[PDB]
Amino acid sequence: MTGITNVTVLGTGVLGSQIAFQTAFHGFAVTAYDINTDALDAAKKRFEGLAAVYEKEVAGAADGAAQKALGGIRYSDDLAQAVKDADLVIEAVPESLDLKRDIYTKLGELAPAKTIFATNSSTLLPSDLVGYTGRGDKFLALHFANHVWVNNTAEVMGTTKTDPEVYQQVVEFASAIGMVPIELKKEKAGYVLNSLLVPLLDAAAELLVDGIADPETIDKTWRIGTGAPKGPFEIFDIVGLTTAYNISSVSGPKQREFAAYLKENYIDKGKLGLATGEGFYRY
Amino acid sequence: MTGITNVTVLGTGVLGSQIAFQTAFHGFAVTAYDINTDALDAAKKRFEGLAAVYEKEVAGAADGAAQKALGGIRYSDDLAQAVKDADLVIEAVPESLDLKRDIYTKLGELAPAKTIFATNSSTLLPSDLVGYTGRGDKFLALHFANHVWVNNTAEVMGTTKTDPEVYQQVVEFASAIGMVPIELKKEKAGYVLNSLLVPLLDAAAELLVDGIADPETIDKTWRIGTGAPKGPFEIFDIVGLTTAYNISSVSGPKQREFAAYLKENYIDKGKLGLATGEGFYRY
Numbered sequence A, B: 001m002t003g004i005t006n007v008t009v010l011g012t013g014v015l016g017s018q019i020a021f022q023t024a025f026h027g028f029a030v031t032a033y034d035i036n037t038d039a040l041d042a043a044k045k046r047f048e049g050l051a052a053v054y055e056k057e058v059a060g061a062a063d064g065a066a067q068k069a070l071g072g073i074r075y076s077d078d079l080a081q082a083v084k085d086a087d088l089v090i091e092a093v094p095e096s097l098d099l100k101r102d103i104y105t106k107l108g109e110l111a112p113a114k115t116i117f118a119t120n121s122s123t124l125l126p127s128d129l130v131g132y133t134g135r136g137d138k139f140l141a142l143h144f145a146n147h148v149w150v151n152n153t154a155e156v157m158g159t160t161k162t163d164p165e166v167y168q169q170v171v172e173f174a175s176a177i178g179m180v181p182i183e184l185k186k187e188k189a190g191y192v193l194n195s196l197l198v199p200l201l202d203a204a205a206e207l208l209v210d211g212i213a214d215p216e217t218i219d220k221t222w223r224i225g226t227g228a229p230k231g232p233f234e235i236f237d238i239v240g241l242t243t244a245y246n247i248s249s250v251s252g253p254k255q256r257e258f259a260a261y262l263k264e265n266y267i268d269k270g271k272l273g274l275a276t277g278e279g280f281y282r283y
């Protein structure tokens, strides 16, 4: 047949760069798109960093293989040229409705008929975007996790409009780039992982904010009770407290009470979690 | 000082027997109370079984130590005699409000002033029972997990009335019988562990019932995403599907929809989980 060969990634931020690099590392012809030459310069820095991480952390990356993947990546700040022969476009632009709306409007026009579109969006449903694409049969979500080389799940989630054959092609692509395809059958805000994790972290937050128990007690209870390696608060530190704060602040009232607790006790003290070396725990 | 030495366990069922045995194994003077001689005969069978499990599974139980703990246990079907010199009474009678109400009414009268009372209740708050005890300062919850020798958490949870010194004595007792004391500061339905686990299992159930993803997909997502050894549905099988059914049937509407799903697809087919060798998974 034909299969996916040319992949364009829109956006070269934290996830955009990991997606493009993982994809290049697995032999696909990757184009990295971003808005201007300065953004593309930064993208190149991220790729060089990722090549270094892979050579130390990823099977098969040693002895120049990651550096070769680095060298094969194409850079473009011209959307029309970036997607001109694209089999797959993975959209990883900022989590902005209007910004994504603008992109898919243009993308739908500029991209050849064959091109499959996939959003990496965490908070926007593909149904919120499918309209702006102009090709609902070729639109779906392909959702990655930060540090794709280790957290290698790829959540595949389409709309009722998505073409079954497109879906399966994206599933095969995901396996081809070393991911574990997590196949959703219907749209769900938060996909699978976030749908499972948020309720756990919310329950932990509630226990803390209502003064039922301290973080350490809550965590050891979870590790002993389920055999899990890390408790909810260790997980908060990994997620990053700034991130947890933002998410909780736009959630229910109990979670908003947690946000204030984070803001007062951690964020305002510079204790942001694993990143700064200290959050609920000191590292 | 004095400390806890004489412990009476009320009820010799699944948890009553494990509590009494773990306590006897750690050198305390244990009396096992139950309603009649036939119940006490069954209790003795459970203890003999537990001694066997310990000798294979528990450090220090080999070479007759567990058999010696077995031999030291006293049996009583006379409540007054059973608690006559009790320092601690652990209540593990059926999860029946009126049945527990009846017990604490009598217990409060028959037990010497020194006696601390602790309920192992999963669904009834100590505040729902504290009134019937007559000694609110000496009443609190000490909540164990099935298979106490491996899941060795002991959740300690009192009322506003509970005496701080009693609480700490129960904490020390818990450590003395080889448990990890999980100290709650305020009453909370479900203590810590259940408070964390139910929301996770509910979210998994919702994903299943609404047809978002299958059990296997949901489980691998959790294991990969959090590094957990077992996913929600593996956990359901361990909990037991009959149990999950009962709990879900008296929960919210989404959970009740899950109960029906369990009833139709698993319970009615004899697939009850780990116990029967097959639930969501085949073992």
Ligand SMILES: NC(=O)c1ccc[n+]([C@@H]2O[C@H](COP(=O)([O-])OP(=O)(O)OC[C@H]3O[C@@H](n4cnc5c(N)ncnc54)[C@H](O)[C@@H]3O)[C@@H](O)[C@H]2O)c1
Binding pocket: A010, A011, A012, A013, A014, A015, A016, A034, A035, A039, A091, A092, A093, A094, A095, A099, A103, A120, A121, A122, A123, A143, A144, A145, A146
């Ligand atoms: N950050 C995460 O952990 C995470 C997890 C899962 C999914 N995602 C999703 O990925 C996307 C965000 O990516 P990120 O946060 O990893 O990187 P980022 O948000 O830090 O970077 C955004 C990229 O898009 C570029 N960009 C900015 N404006 C643009 C525009 N107008 N047109 C095209 N590109 C533009 C930015 O310059 C940058 O290259 C969102 O859909 C987000 O929901 C992020």
Ligand SMILES: NC(=O)c1ccc[n+]([C@@H]2O[C@H](COP(=O)([O-])OP(=O)(O)OC[C@H]3O[C@@H](n4cnc5c(N)ncnc54)[C@H](O)[C@@H]3O)[C@@H](O)[C@H]2O)c1
Binding pocket: B010, B011, B012, B013, B014, B015, B016, B034, B035, B039, B091, B092, B093, B094, B095, B099, B103, B120, B121, B122, B123, B143, B144, B145, B146
């Ligand atoms: N089963 C669990 O996994 C679990 C977990 C945590 C806490 N608990 C709690 O422990 C108690 C239930 O114990 P279990 O389910 O492990 O054993 P069980 O319920 O199978 O056995 C109940 C024991 O109480 C006895 N009993 C019956 N009527 C009595 C009465 N009228 N007066 C005194 N004793 C009576 C029964 O004969 C038996 O000895 C409840 O408080 C329950 O919430 C159970």
